[PDB]
Structure formats: C-alpha cells, structure tokens
Amino acid sequence: QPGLLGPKALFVFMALSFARDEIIWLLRHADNMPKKSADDFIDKHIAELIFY
Amino acid sequence: LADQIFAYYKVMAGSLLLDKRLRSECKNQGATIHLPPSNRYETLLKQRHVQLLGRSIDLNRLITQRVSAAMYKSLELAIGRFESEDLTSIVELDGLLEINRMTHKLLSRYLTLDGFDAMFREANHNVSAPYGRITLHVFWELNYDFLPNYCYNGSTNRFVRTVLPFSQEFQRDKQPNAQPQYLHGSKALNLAYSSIYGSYRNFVGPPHFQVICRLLGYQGIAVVMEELLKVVKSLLQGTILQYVKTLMEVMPKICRLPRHEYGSPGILEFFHHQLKDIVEYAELKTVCFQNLREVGNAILFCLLIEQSLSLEEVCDLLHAAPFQNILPRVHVKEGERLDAKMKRLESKYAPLHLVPLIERLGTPQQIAIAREGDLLTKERLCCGLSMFEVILTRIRSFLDDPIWRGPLPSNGVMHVDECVEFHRLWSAMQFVYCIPVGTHEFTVEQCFGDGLHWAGCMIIVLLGQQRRFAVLDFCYHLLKVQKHDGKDEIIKNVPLKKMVERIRKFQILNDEIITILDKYLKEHVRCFQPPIHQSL
Amino acid sequence: LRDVLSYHIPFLVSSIEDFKDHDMKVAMNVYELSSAAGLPCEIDPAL
Amino acid sequence: IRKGIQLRKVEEQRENDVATILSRRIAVEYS
Amino acid sequence: YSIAFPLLCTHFMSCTHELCPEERHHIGDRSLSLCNMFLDEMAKQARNLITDICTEQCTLSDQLLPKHCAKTISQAVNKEKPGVESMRKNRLVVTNLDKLHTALSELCFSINYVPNMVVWEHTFTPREYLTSHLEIRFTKSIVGMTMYNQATQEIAKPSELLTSVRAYMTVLQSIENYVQIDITRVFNNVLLQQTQHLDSHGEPTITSLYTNWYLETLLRQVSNGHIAYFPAMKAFVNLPTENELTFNAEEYSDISEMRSLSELLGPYGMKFLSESLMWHISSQVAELKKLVVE
Ligand SMILES: [Cl-]
Ligand SMILES: [Cl-]
Ligand SMILES: [Cl-]
C-alpha cells in the first residue's frame, strides 16, 4: 500500500535511523572489543537488516 | 515370402538400434541377445517379370502390397498399444515408432512404399482430422491420470504417483498380443526393449516432456494448453469456488496475531482453537487439496512443456544456422579484425546459403517454397515469445467471484484481523498441512507433491495477495515468535519445534513459487488525505 | 547427419531434396549444398 | 475422444482366400 | 539478501566533503571495485550451484541409459529404480538436491532483485555477470564431459556426451524461472561455437576433438587390422585379433552414436569431419599415382 508512505513517512525515517544506529554501533565494537565468547559481536543476519 | 521379408527387415531395424553397451553387458551376464542371421532376399525383390505359365508376374509389386500392409499394421499396433497405457509409456512408443521408421527405410531400398510420414499420419488418424490419436490420448491421460494422481518434486524436476488411497484407478483395455514382427521384431528384442523402457514408467520428467513435445507439435501443444485452461476454469469456478465459499464461513470472523509476549506454545494453542473447524473439516484433503493439486499440476504442465519446446526449437535453429548464413563469433589473433575474418568466413559457407542459391538456379515455384520454408524455420517461439505469462493472465479472469477478494476494508486500507480474503483461508490450510503426522503416516507432500502449493500460491499472486499473506500468515507468525523465544513444548500433540521446522520448509517453497509467478507476471497508486481543518 | 536434419529442419531439407533431384561446374554447387545436409551425391564434392 | 473410442471398439468388425486361410493357421500359434 | 552489499556501494560518495577533494576519487574507485567484486562473486556462486545441480541431473540421466537394464534381461531369461529418489516422504529429510535448489533460488532472488544500480555514475547490471559466467561454464563443462585424453586415446561416447549436454540444458533452461535472462541466446552462443574447429577464444572444440579421435584412433586401428566395417551392423566393429584396444568401435560408430555425433557437431562440424577424412584420402591417392607411374 504505497499510499501509506504519506501518513506513515515518520516511521520510514525512524526505522532507517534505528537500524543505521545499530549497524554503526556493531561495526565499531566488533572491530575494537575483545570477545567474551566466540559469537560476540558477530551478526550472521546483518545482510537481512541492510536489505530491508 | 512377403511375410518373412517383412519380419527379416523389422528384426534388422530392431538390432541396428539396440544399444551396443547393453548388448555386451548381456553377453557377459551369460544372456546374449542373439544377432539375427543374414539373408539373401534382394534378387527376389528385384524380380519385375517372372515368366510362369505364359504370364509375366511382377513379384516386386506383389511383395510391396503385403509389406505395405505390414508396415501399416505395425504402426496401428504401436499407437493402439499407447492408447491402452498411461502417459509414461509415450517414451516406449517413441522408440517403437523409430524402429518402424528404420524398417520403412530398409524396405525402401528395394520397394516403393508410401512416405513414412503419410503412413504415420494415416495410422494416427491425422489426415482428415486436425489432432491425431497420440495427441488425443495424451490429453485423455492428463485429464484422467496425470493431473489427479501425480506429485511434483521441484528439486528433481520429476513427477511421481500419489499414495494408495488417493490413487484413482480406472480399467484399461489391455491389447491382445500380436506377432513379434509387428513390434520390435522378435521375442528377444521385445523383452530387451521393454526392459530398456521400464526405467521411464516410474516418473514423468524431461524425457517424457521432450517426447510429448515432438509428437504433439505446435498444434497439439496449443490444444492441450487451451484445454488445460478449461479444466482449471471449470475447477476454480466450480468445486473449488464451492468449497472456498463454504470454508470462508466456517472460518473465524476475526483472527488477530497474538503478541510475542504470550509465548510460542500459547500462540500455537490459540491457532489450534481458532482454526479447529478448518482442521477437522473431513473433506479438506480428499476434495479441497485434491482439486488444488490438479490445478497446480495443470499449470506446471504448461510451464514445463513450454521449456521443452524452447529446448526443441533452439536445437532446430542450431542445425538451421549453416543454411541460414548464421555464423558464430571467430577467434581474432593480433593483426586481424573481427569484421575482416567474419566476412571471409561468410565466403566459405556461401555455397550452403540455401535461399540465395535457389534464387540463383531454381524455378519460381522452388524459390517461393524455399522462401516460405525459410520463414518457418527461423521464426520460432524461443526467438522472442513466451507463453506462461498468457496462461497466468487468463487464469486471473477466472477469479471474478467476489469471495476471492471479499468486502472493502473497514480502515480504508487493508484487512488485518478479518478472515475475508482467500490468502487467509490458505493460511488456515497451511496450518493444517504443517502439522506433523505420525512416523508411519503419509504427509501432504507425499500425497500431493508441489502442485498443491503452486495452485494455492497462484491464486494468491493473481489476486495480488502475496504481500498481505507474507505479513499476516498464521504459521509464519508462530515461526517468528518461536525463533525469538526458542521454546519447545508438545501443544495439542503437535511438537512445536517439529511444527516450526516444517513451517520453514513450506515458507521456503512458497517464497520460491511466489517469486517465480511474480517474475513471469512481469500504475497510479491509491493516495490518502492529510487531516483537514474545520476552517476549509 | 541426413536423418538428424530431416527431423530438425524438414522444411529446409524438403527444398534441398527437390533442388537436387531436378552443366558440370554449376551442378557442383547444388551438390555441396546437398552433401552439407547429408544427401548422397553421385559425385562427391568434398572428394 | 470418449465417442472416438466407441467408434473404434464397436465400430471395428462391421473366406476361401489363401492369405486369410494361412493367417488363421498362424494366428493360432500365438493366441 | 546479498544484493544489499553492492547496493551499499552507492552510499560511498556521501562520505566526501568539498574541503577534501584529494580523497574523493580514491573512495570512488573503491566503491566501483567493491561493487564489481560483489556482483562477480554472487554470479560465481550461482554458477557453482548450477554446475552442482547439472552434475546431479547428469547422474539421473545416466541411470536411464540402456546399459543398466542388463541385470533385468538376464534374470528374466533364467526363471534403485529411477523415480524413487523423487518420492518424497517428508520435507524435513533434506536431500543434496534440496540444498542446492534452495541455495540457488535464494541467491537468484538477489541477482534478479534490481535490473541495475548506479555507483558513482557508473551503471552495474547484476544479471549480466550471471549470463557471462554461464556461457563460460557451459563451454567449460562440455569440453570437460568429452573426457578427452591424448595419451590414453580416450574420449566420451557421443551418445553419453549428448545425454549429459541435454541434462545441462534442462537445468540451464530453468534459470529463466529465477532471473530475467535469455538462456536461449547463451545456448546459441556456446553450442554454435562448438561446431567450429576452434571457438571464439581459439580453444579446441568437440568438433576438433572428435574429428581428431576418429582419424587418429578409430580409423588408424582399422588400417592396423583390428577393426572392420560391418555393413550388416552399419558400424565399425572390433575384430577378434590379438590386440590391446581400449575401446569398442561399435560403441563409437553405430547408427545411434553417429546420430548423437551429428546432433552435437551439426552441419558445420560434420562438414569439417569430412574435410579431414578427405585429406587422408588425398594422401592415399597421391601415393597410388606414384605406383602407377612406376
Ligand atoms: Cl553481538
Ligand atoms: Cl509355358
Ligand atoms: Cl511397446
């Protein structure tokens, strides 16, 4: 329902902003923080988040 | 003399075309397929004036009379044998037709017979009729056996027979056995060839589709597609419509997707209760799933037959290429040009350029026939045309009944909690078929194969309901919540972990199918008003 | 080759067979086009 | 097609000939 | 979702500022290089999955060949059947073909997701990476399946090669289900090149490989006395001599085999085969004339 982009415009930019925030956070922490366990700061489903 | 001459040349044909590796393998196994003894019939076949009791007897003419009758009887038997068997036997038919072709060729070295195509068209009843016996038996078997009894496997690209209780059997008039000379030539050859084609009886796939394509031609395919469309129109607007209308009422008026917090076990319990009447509906599989599988198998047949046709056309065009001036790209060494050598190679194959040569040396009648022939050879469907889109577009027009889409949404946008669109009923049906069954029970995929899901997904796509289905589906929601909480309980005898594993499998399948349908089905949108002040 | 073409390109083969069945330097061009479609020729052009 | 089958089963079969006589003698050694 | 990565390359220019133009082109070139690499790798993986499916289907096609029926013939003259693999009991049982099929469809969704993308004013077309790799791979597999070895004088039976080529084509045709590509034109491109003595890249073809083998292996052993033409069988056949032949001549020269060869070589290829046959007759003729003059 592409018409919803009218009334729900804010949610689009909210969603983009929130997801963007999480990606840049993960990026810097994966690169800079020692792991407690092997799966720490590894998100195998990150592509799904970027795709949407 | 005529009897043994025909039998001799049939056995020769059967031997010539018998796989050499199989021959040697049988020899090593101590079961040598014994090669027929050679004979000397030619001098008898060359006798045009036997002088007997003052008469001049044309022995050649007399032999031909009988040999021609034997050829026709062979062809009648081959087609009649097909008519007494299921669709998988068409491969066997094709082999037998090829042996008959070889027989005619061997006999034509000494005798004058009607053209093989003429003989075949007559036996096929395709001289004074537009569709032959082979084409008509194919549709007969599609309608009575293939559509109702076969299960598509999308990973192997093969169809197989359904489970016993769904196997719709019908009595076949098994043909009386004629003499070996009218089949493959001898008992040994008959046994050898029936073993060879035994492999092809347990499935329907690319080889069967390849054969069907050749034997039906463009006209046979067209009529079968047109008739499959009529079967689908009849099923969708008839019994399926009837059961959809029935089940839409039995369906819960409203069904909300419960929030994550309730947990996956509780959500499973919720769906069980809410969809109990769809679950317990006695004829859901025997009638509803059955009729949908038939729709799916019909639409699959069209897709797969188009693909076989495309493979057939491309191969034809490759062999046409040298007589049609068409050359592949050539390798260019340093100091050479692409245009320089391509023109030079065009010179080499100029004596093979058919139409120009006939235009140079042929009669106005020859030229006109060649020009028409050339146009028929180069212009194939694979060149720039496709069919599956047209098939789908036309099935959409069979869904004009108001209960496919339901009433206008309360919110002016879309239905959410309401169960008034087909996709919602499909979601209830999906709930049923995702439920795990006992270890010794047959599953939906064992009984109906992929065709069921092709049909259900096709309806959703053609109604433009696939996005709302993706969002609102019950099973997808359960899977989503279970992924989050990772809980595993046996709710109403349904082990949740096993249930959500199956949901994922059908989700994968649905997404592939929906994506394919959307791809082949290759503007202004509904806009909404911003709030308005009382001022104006 | 002949049997494969007659099955793949019958409309072209038909025209070729007619054209062959109906000079001595000009007749070689008919034969080269014929032998390319697997038609047996009295005189072999490639030879 | 249904009527087309009936016009081949019922419409099917609707002699001191040497060939005929020889055929019958051979046809027994198979059926 | 792999198409997200090349799409992200379009963002790279947003990081630049008018006060540091020194870095702009470096970042630009980085976005192009990465986009190209992502799309190439996505195409290579689809290519790899397709090859694996082809191999699986060639095996299924092989299982249909007459040679496998010998046991059935022999046991009938004394006193795992195709299709069983397709009989699915439960979708939770995951076959190799299931895995390959799913992985292929998932990735083709990404390759077909967008017709093209614009990265730093350059236009990238994902499907064209797939088309190109399929052409090259199909060529590669055809020559591979010919199983040609100079040293041992071995080559595939034409009928078996043709069977495998057909299975490949069936799988490749199915790609049109997933991606807006014309597979017919890749068939054209690859197969018509195979009819020539060398392809567009100057490499040997099935035509040149078979032409060489029939002359240098089969017909040479006829001269050596180990094989004879059998008009009765319409084939060349191994003679019962004291020899060390590694092949059965009838399995390369009978009607079905020669028909299979013609399917693959076509008029171009068969014409080339004959020209090579004629060269060897020329040499024999030149030698005969010498004996006539003598
Ligand atoms: Cl993490
Ligand atoms: Cl007399
Ligand atoms: Cl049969």
Q: Which residues of B touch D26 (CB under 8 A)?
A: 179
Task: Please tell me which residue of chain B has the smallest CA distance to C27.
Answer: B361
Q: How far apart are CA B418 and CA B409, in angstroms?
A: 9
Count Cα atoms within 13 angstroms, Cβ side, for B497. 4
Single-letter residue type at B470: A
Cα angle vertex E287, ends E281, E293, to 5°?
135
The answer for residues whose C-beta is within 8 angstroms of residue E65's C-beta and 6 or more apart is B19, B21, E160, E163
For chain B, the distance separating the N- and C-terminal CA atoms, rounded to the nearest angstrom, is 106
State how far the Cα of E222 lies from the Cα of E215, in Å rounded to an integer: 10
- C41: alpha, beta or left, given left = phi > 0 and alpha = psi -120 to 50? beta
Distant-in-sequence, close-in-space partners of B91: CB < 8 Å, separation ≥ 6: B197, B200, B207, B208, B211
Report whether C39 contacts C2 (CB < 8 A): yes
- Three-state secondary-structure class, residue B435: coil
Please state at what angle helix E126-145 crosses helix E206-213, rounded to 10 degrees.
0
Query: Phi/psi at B310 (nearest 5 deg)?
Result: -60, -40
Which residue, chain included where needed, has tokens 């090593």? B28
CB within 8 Å of B480: residues ≥ 6 apart? none
Kindly give the pairing relationship between strand E235-238 and strand E227-230: antiparallel
For tokens 């087909």, the residue is B422
Identify whether the C-beta of residue A39 lies closer than 8 Å to the C-beta of residue A26.
no
Query: Residues with Cβ < 8 Å from E111, sequence gap 6 or more?
Result: E3, E42, E43, E46, E126, E127, E129, E130, E178, E179
What sign does the dihedral A30-A35-A38-A41 (CA atoms) show?
negative
Contact C39, C46 (CB under 8 A): no
| Minimum Cα–Cα distance from E265: chain C residue | C1
Distance from CA of D17 to the nearest CA of B (A): 14
- Other Cβ atoms less than 10 A from the Cβ of B495: the count is 13
List chain B residues with CB under 8 Å of A8: none
Contact B88, B140 (CB under 8 A): no
What 8-state DSSP symbol labels residue B352? G
Look at residue B410 and give its three-state secondary structure. Answer: coil
Q: Which helix (H) or strand (E) holds B51?
A: strand B50-52
Q: What is d(CA E77, CA B188) in angstroms, rounded to the nearest whole number?
A: 9
* Cα–Cα dist B476/B507, whole Å: 7
What does the buried/exposed string (b/e) look like for B460-493 if buried means 16 or more CB atoms within 10 Å of the residue's CB?
A: bbbbebbebbeebbbbbbbbbbbeeeeeeeebee
> Up-side HSE of residue D23: CA atoms within 13 Å toward CB?
10
How does DSSP assign B69-129, residue by residue?
Answer: HHHHHHHHHHHHHHHTS-GGGHHHHHHHHHHHHHHHHHHHTTS----HHHHHHHHTT-SSS
Breaks (C–N over 2.5 Å) after residues, chain E:
79
Contact B324/B354 with Cβ under 8 angstroms?
A: yes
Which of E226, E228, E234, E284 has its CA nearest to residue E255?
A: E234
Say how far apart CA B134 and CA B124 lie, in whole Å: 7
**Residues forming beta bridges with residue B51, ordered by sequence position:** B56
- Single out the residue of B298, B302, B299, B303 nearest to residue B147, CA to CA: B298
Q: In angstroms, rounded to a whole number, what is the distance separating the alpha carbons of residues B134 and B82?
A: 8
Contact B400, B245 (CB under 8 A): no
Distance B283 CA to ligand 2 centre (A): 85
Looking at residue B299, its amino acid is I
B377 contacts chain C (CB < 8 A): yes
Task: Supply B53's token pair.
Answer: 């009791």
Rounded Cα distance between B80 and B89, Å, is 12
- Whether residue B284 contacts residue B429, with contact meaning beta carbons closer than 8 Å, is answered with yes
Give the dihedral sign, CA B106/B108/B113/B116: positive
Joined tokens for residue B257: 């997707």
Dist. CA B393–CA B407, nearest whole Å: 23
Go through B8-20 and write b for each residue having 16 or more CB atoms within 10 A of its CB, e for each that does not: bbbbbbbbbbbbb
Asked if B78 and B100 count as a contact pair (C-beta separation under 8 A), the reply is yes
Which residues are CB-contacts of E130 (< 8 A; sequence separation ≥ 6)?
Answer: E43, E46, E47, E111, E175, E179, E181
Cα–Cα distance for residue pair B323/B320, rounded to 1 Å: 6
CA distance E145 to E154: 12
Q: Would you call B204 helix, strand, or coil by DSSP?
A: strand
The CB density around residue B126, as the number of other CB atoms within 10 Å, is 20
Touching B: which chains, 3+ CB pairs < 8 A?
Answer: A, C, D, E
- Residue B22 contacts residue B82 (beta carbons within 8 Å): no
In sequence order, the 6+-apart residues with CB closer than 8 A to the CB of B47 are: B57, B58, B59, B60
CA atoms within 13 A on the CB side of B350: 8
Cβ atoms of B34 and E273 within 8 Å: the answer is no
B116 HSE (CA, 13 A, CB side) = 15
Which one of B20, B32, B158 would you mutate to disrupt binding with E, by most E Cβ within 10 Å of its Cβ?
B20
DSSP B132-163: -HHHHHHHHHIIIIIHHHEEEETTTTEEEE--
DSSP 8-state symbol, B321: G
Chains that touch E (3 or more CB pairs under 8 A): A, B, C
The CA distance from B11 to B92, in Å, is 17
| Spatial CA neighbour of B140 closest among E78, D2, E232, C26 | D2
Which of E137, E102, E109, E135 shows the shortest CA–CA distance to E42? E109
Q: Are E237 and B16 in contact (CB under 8 A)?
A: no
| E202: Cα separation from own chain's centroid | 17
Chain B contact for C30, CB < 8 A?
yes
Which residue matches tokens 């001289």? B127
Residue with tokens 């065709």: B451
Query: Chain centroid to CA E1: how far?
Result: 30
Residue B452 vs residues B44, B293, B366, C32: alpha-carbon distances, Å: 63, 4, 53, 56
Spatial neighbors of B373 by CB under 8 A, at least 6 apart, are: C11, C12, C14, C15
Q: CB-hemisphere CA count at 13 Å for B318?
A: 26
How far is residue B110's CA from residue E40's CA, in Å, rounded to a whole number? 62
In chain B, the residue whose alpha carbon lies closest to the alpha carbon of E256 is: B17
Token reading at E214: 């029939």
Amino acid at residue number B122? E
* Residues E178/E109, Cβ–Cβ less than 8 Å: yes
Backbone gaps in chain D, preceding residues (C–N over 2.5 A): 14
Q: Which ligand is nearest to the CA of B52?
A: 2
B413 touches chain A (CB under 8 A): yes
To the nearest whole Å, the CA of A8 is away from the closest chain B CA by 11
Beta-ladder partners of E238: E227
Which residues, including other chains, have CB under 8 Å from residue A48's CB and lie 6 or more apart? E1
Residues in chain E: 294
Q: How far is the CA of B223 from the centre of ligand 1 (A)?
A: 60
Helix B451-462 and helix B496-520, axial crossing angle in degrees, nearest 10: 60
Centroid of ligand 3 to alpha carbon of B195 (angstroms): 11
> Which residues have a Cβ under 8 Å from the Cβ of B154 and sit 6 or more positions away?
B450, B509, B512, E101
Give the separation between CA E284 and CA D20, rounded to whole angstroms.
Answer: 58
Q: Minimal CA–CA distance to E264: which of E163, E180, E189, E182?
A: E163
Q: Is A42 helix (H, G, I), strand (E, B) or coil?
A: coil
Chain A residue numbers touching B527 (CB-CB < 8 A): 3, 6
Q: φ and ψ at E154, to 5 degrees? A: -105, 150
* SS3 track for B62-80: HHHHHHHHHHHHHHHHHHH
- The conformation of residue B333, written as its DSSP 8-state character, comes to -
DSSP assignment of B158-194:
EEEE--GGG-------PPPP--GGGTTSSHHHHHHHH
In order, the DSSP letters of chain E are: -TTHHHHHGGGGGGG--TT-GGGHHHHHHHHHHHHHHHHHHHHHHHHHHHHHHHHHHHHHHHTTSGGGGHHHHHHHTT---TTGGG--S-TTS--HHHHHHHHHHHHHHHHTS-S-EEETTEEE-HHHHHHHHHHHHHHHHHHHHTT-BTTTTB---HHHHHHHHHHHHHHHHHGGGTSS--HHHHHHHHHHHTTSSB-TTS-B-HHHHHHHHIIIIIIHHHHTTSEEEETTTTEEEE-SSS----S-THHHHSHHHHHHHHHHHHHHHHHHHHHHHHHHHHHHHHHHHHHHH-
Token pair listed for A32 = 């800079």
Under 8 Å CB-to-CB from B208, ≥6 apart: which residues? Answer: B87, B88, B90, B91, B200
Q: What is the resolution of this structure in A?
A: 2.3
Name the one residue in this structure whose structure tokens are 């050879």: B377
Tell me the C-alpha distance between E46 and E54, whole Å.
12
Our CA angle for E91, B208, B297, nearest 5°, is 45
Quick check: B526 and A1 in contact, CB under 8 A? Answer: yes
Alpha helices (H) along B338-387:
338-348, 354-361, 364-378
Q: What residues does E204 pair with on adjacent strands?
A: E198
CA of B91 to the centre of ligand 3 (A): 9
Q: If you search the block for the tokens 């597999």, which residue do you land on?
A: E141
Q: Do B351 and C33 touch (CB under 8 A)?
A: yes
Tell me how far apart the alpha carbons of residues E98 and E88 are, in angstroms, rounded to a whole number.
Answer: 11
Q: Identify which of B380, B201, C39, B429 has the alpha carbon closest to the alpha carbon of residue E270.
A: C39
Give backbone dihedrals phi and psi of C39, rounded to 5 degrees, phi first.
Answer: -75, 130
Integer Cα distance of E67 and B380 in angstroms = 36
Residue B255 token pair = 């069904």
| Short-list B61, B46, B58, B63, CA closest to B4 | B63
CA gap E105, E14 in Å, rounded? 33
| Distance (Å) from the alpha carbon of E243 to chain B's nearest alpha carbon | 18
Residue type, B435: I
Structure tokens at B246: 């029935």
- Three-class SS of residue C37? coil
Mutual angle of helices B496-520 and B474-485, in 10-degree steps: 130
Q: What angle, rounded to 10 degrees, do the helices at B59-83 and B116-123 form? A: 50
- Per DSSP, B529 falls in state P
